Amino acid sequence: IAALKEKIAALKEKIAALKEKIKDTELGMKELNEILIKEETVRRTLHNELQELRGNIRVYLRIRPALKNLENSDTSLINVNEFDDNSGVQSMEVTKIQNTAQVHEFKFDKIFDQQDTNVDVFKEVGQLVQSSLDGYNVAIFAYGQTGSGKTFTMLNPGDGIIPSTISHIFNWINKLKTKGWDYKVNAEFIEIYNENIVDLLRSSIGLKHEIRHDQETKTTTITNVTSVKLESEEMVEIILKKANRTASNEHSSRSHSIFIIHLSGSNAKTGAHSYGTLNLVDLAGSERINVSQVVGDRLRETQNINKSLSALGDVIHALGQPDSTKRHIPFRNSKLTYLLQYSLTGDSKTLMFVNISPSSSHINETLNSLRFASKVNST
Amino acid sequence: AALEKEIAALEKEIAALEKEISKQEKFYNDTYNTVCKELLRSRRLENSIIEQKGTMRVYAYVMEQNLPENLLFDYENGVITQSEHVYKFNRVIPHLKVSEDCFFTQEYSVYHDMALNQKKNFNLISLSTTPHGSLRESLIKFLAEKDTIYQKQYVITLQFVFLSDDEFSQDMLLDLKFEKHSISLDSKLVIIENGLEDLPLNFSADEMGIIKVQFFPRDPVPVDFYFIELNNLKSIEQFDKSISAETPIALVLKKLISDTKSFFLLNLNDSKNVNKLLTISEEVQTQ
Numbered sequence: 092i093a094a095l096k097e098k099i100a101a102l103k104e105k106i107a108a109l110k111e112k113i114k115d116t117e118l119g120m121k122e123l124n125e126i127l128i129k130e131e132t133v134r135r136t137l138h139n140e141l142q143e144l145r146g147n148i149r150v151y152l153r154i155r156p157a158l159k160n161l162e163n164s165d166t167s168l169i170n171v172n173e174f175d176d177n178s179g180v181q182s183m184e185v186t187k188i189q190n191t192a193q194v195h196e197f198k199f200d201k202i203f204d205q206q207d208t209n210v211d212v213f214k215e216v217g218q219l220v221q222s223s224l225d226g227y228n229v230a231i232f233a234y235g236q237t238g239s240g241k242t243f244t245m246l247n248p249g250d251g252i253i254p255s256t257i258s259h260i261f262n263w264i265n266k267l268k269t270k271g272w273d274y275k276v277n278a279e280f281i282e283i284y285n286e287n288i289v290d291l292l293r294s295s296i297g298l299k300h301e302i303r304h305d306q307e308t309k310t311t312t313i314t315n316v317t318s319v320k321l322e323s324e325e326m327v328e329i330i331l332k333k334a335n336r337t338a339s340n341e342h343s344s345r346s347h348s349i350f351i352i353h354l355s356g357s358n359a360k361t362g363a364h365s366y367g368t369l370n371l372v373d374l375a376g377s378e379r380i381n382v383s384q385v386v387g388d389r390l391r392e393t394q395n396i397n398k399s400l401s402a403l404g405d406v407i408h409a410l411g412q413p414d415s416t417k418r419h420i421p422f423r424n425s426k427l428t429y430l431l432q433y434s435l436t437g438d439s440k441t442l443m444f445v446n447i448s449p450s451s452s453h454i455n456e457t458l459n460s461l462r463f464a465s466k467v468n469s470t
Numbered sequence: 471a472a473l474e475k476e477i478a479a480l481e482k483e484i485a486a487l488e489k490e491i492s493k494q495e496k497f498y499n500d501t502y503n504t505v506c507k508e509l510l511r512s513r514r515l516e517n518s519i520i521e522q523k524g525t526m527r528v529y530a531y532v533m534e535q536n537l538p539e540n541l542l543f544d545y546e547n548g549v550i551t552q553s554e555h556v557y558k559f560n561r562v563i564p565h566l567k568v569s570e571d572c573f574f575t576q577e578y579s580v581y582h583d584m585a586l587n588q589k590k591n592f593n594l595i596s597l598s599t600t601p602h603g604s605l606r607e608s609l610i611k612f613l614a615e616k617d618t619i620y621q622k623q624y625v626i627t628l629q630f631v632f633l634s635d636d637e638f639s640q641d642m643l644l645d646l647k648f649e650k651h652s653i654s655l656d657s658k659l660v661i662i663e664n665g666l667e668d669l670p671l672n673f674s675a676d677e678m679g680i681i682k683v684q685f686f687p688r689d690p691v692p693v694d695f696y697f698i699e700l701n702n703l704k705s706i707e708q709f710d711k712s713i714s715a716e717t718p719i720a721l722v723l724k725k726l727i728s729d730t731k732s733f734f735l736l737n738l739n740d741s742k743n744v745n746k747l748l749t750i751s752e753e754v755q756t757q
């Protein structure tokens with residue numbers, strides 16, 4: 092019957108129509124995926140431009156919540172002004188009330204107050220972690236007196252800068268997989284105490300840890316320091332815990348701790364590569380120690396910390412000046428600045444977190460931290 | 471029944487191919503949605519960059535159906551080249567790839583949400599040499615359709631008038647005082663709840679006109695949006711006006727350009743009057 096003969100023809104025609112639909116959809120998806128791959132490259136460029144405009148050197152103040160009853164509950168000496176959207180600056184004042192009021196004014200790129208959580212803080216820090224993934228060097232420092240909240244800011248479980256950073260890293264790496272990107276993550280975790288480097292990832296006394304710079308690649312290694320490949324958030328959490336911050340926390344408060352993350356990206360579909368180093372630094376307490384009745388070791392420990400912190404301030408101050416290439420910047424003077432030199436120059440991004448107490452108990456030390464903050468402000 | 475057996479074999483192959491197609495559609499839709507989301511991620515960065523630099527927003531919307539071969543468009547770098555003259559733009563948008571609805575969701579919504587969220591009175595100034603109402607049409611759909619997020623958290627009101635030199639000037643809905651930092655109008659006030667249905671049949675027709683849109687937040691001060699159109703050569707010539715007069719047309723233009731957030735859009739359509747549009751876009755950025 093011709094009806095069946097006409098039915099076969101229509102089916103064979105439909106077959107060819109469906110096979111061509113599949114081929115067209117494959118082509119369309121291929122084209123959509125090339126847009127995605129290209130757009131990731133576009134995003135990196137745009138993101139860096141924004142980072143430049145917001146400043147390669149930034150200073151954030153963080154006022155932690157008051158602690159009862161470990162300090163005076165009086166927080167009235169500090170006044171924080173609203174973020175000025177026009178100038179991009181946020182100011183604050185310290186006032187001592189007397190016949191002639193003692194006033195000290197300070198300006199920051201941002202001020203986080205008592206109510207601002209680690210989640211709030213990371214809304215601003217995340218963009219710098221992104222820069223590292225995109226192939227730029229980043230240094231984030233937490234500065235302030237012992238008790239001001241440096242370690243909480245950096246390491247509070249789940250939402251500290253470091254755990255938030257690890258989460259961001261692995262989530263972004265997972266997303267990038269679908270766009271041709273393969274990433275290797277390797278880390279070192281070290282301590283600087285009295286201008287000596289200790290490996291916090293060792294698994295002992297006479298081991299030499301010396302800074303080695305490679306001028307050609309602008310990379311730095313330390314001799315005999317453990318480097319570990321980071322494979323997941325959970326794996327880092329285990330590694331962090333083992334390394335950790337009474338004897339231990341006293342030592343930790345008198346030394347710098349530095350978490351160094353290398354983000355190595357390659358795309359086989361475009362031939363693109365990227366390499367960024369992220370440095371997360373929990374600094375030695377900045378408090379002025381009364382050294383009069385103190386023992387020699389304690390005196391020298393105080394001197395080294397002051398030297399190290401002052402050099403960091405000197406270096407970052409100099410880098411924020413218009414005449415940065417013209418003037419000489421002595422990274423070599425201190426072990427911290429010398430170690431991090433390639434993450435402080437060029438296209439690198441620097442963030443100084445200055446942690447303070449809101450309490451009247453600590454007003455003098457707070458003023459020191461605020462003066463340090465003013466020194467590291469860029470022009 | 472050999473022919474009937476062949477039909478069964480061809481119906482089985484159709485079934486196998488259609489199953490493959492249905493699966494493929496899922497993947498395609500995911501990738502298609504990701505592309506749209508990633509493009510918007512870029513637009514957010516671009517918008518943040520514009521805010522930092524404080525530069526004026528000037529965008530080009532190009533219909534290259536009947537345009538000269540001499541004029542070259544760089545849709546990736548925001549450049550139109552004639553002759554060795556280079557015209558700079560925030561973004562040069564292809565009409566072939568981006569519809570009027572897509573313009574508002576993909577290329578405009580970031581700007582819109584920003585101004586609306588920081589309670590800044592803002593505008594869209596659209597320039598064209600050929601009258602076309604599908605852009606104005608899409609604007610209403612984007613803003614004040616029943617199910618939009620803007621209808622959800624704001625009560626939306628509209629006033630549509632047309633100013634002509636000189637001096638009147640009429641209402642476009644039927645058949646001005648400058649207070650503080652906003653333009654008040656004594657005209658017909660229409661609340662939109664269902665989109666173009668609440669507007670007359672002559673609204674999207676003809677495919678200086680001023681549309682004022684007010685946003686009243688639900689749970690006090692209304693956020694103002696202004697939509698300016700210049701339909702032809704004569705209308706844009708009056709916009710130039712020695713960077714000369716005090717016509718009511720120029721009186722509101724100067725007010726919006728100085729007191730509100732501006733968004734300049736160039737609609738390039740006809741081949742005859744492209745060069746005049748391009749020159750004024752250069753004049754807007756420099757002045």
Ligand SMILES: Nc1ncnc2c1ncn2[C@@H]1O[C@H](COP(=O)(O)OP(=O)(O)O)[C@@H](O)[C@H]1O
Pocket residue numbers: 154155156158209235236237238239240241242243244336344446
């Ligand atoms: N942002 C914060 N929110 C709540 N508690 C905080 C915050 N910052 C610090 N603290 C608390 O203050 C105390 C001192 O903080 P710590 O991180 O040890 O300071 P530092 O490392 O500067 O000596 C700890 O009990 C810590 O839990």
Ligand SMILES: [Mg+2]
Pocket residue numbers: 241242243336343344
């Ligand atoms: Mg600590």
